[PDB]
């Protein structure tokens, strides 16, 4: 094989996105998902479609888990979140070859509401 | 934004054992390495069903017909020149799948029988 595939641990960020917690409060929250390709040929023929597929599963996972917890669950809870959305989003990504090591959530955004 | 990355770092492949003939008439066994790069990574992708076997034919195809216009003497005394402008027409042959020839190295110049 000549052209390979970097199986280097590699990120990208998760755009802030809109959600409405259990005490209903509007937040804005980003994020970033650390990863690998783990398998070289499963991810090459799904090289056309994976990266946004990737990015989308990464946002409605973030949007899920936040939309079930406090405001002050968020901060307390944060590892307990970040590896909930690792197995979620891990197991959604088997399928073309990418490893997910982490989901962590950065910066919580407030505005009025 | 891409999400598999492509490997960028220069890497080699073996060119197998070539059976030329010479100018002058006398058959070699040259075997050679190539070392290149993916320089567009869109461009190589797009092409990846085809772009490995392709290069590594017009490797042997581009060491072959350099040796064939050298005389014995010349191969023995000016490889130096001969890896350099080989390195050149495979460059020019690869440039359309996203590759990037670094350097060709001859490496053994046997005598069958």
Redesign the interface.
Known sequence: ????????T?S?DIPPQEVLTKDSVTISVDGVVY?R?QNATL??AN?TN??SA??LLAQTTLRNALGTKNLSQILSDREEIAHHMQSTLDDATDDWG?KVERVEIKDVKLPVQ
């Open positions: 094989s000549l052209i390979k595939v970097d199986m280097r590699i990208f990863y390709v991810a090459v090289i994976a990266d990737t990015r990418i």
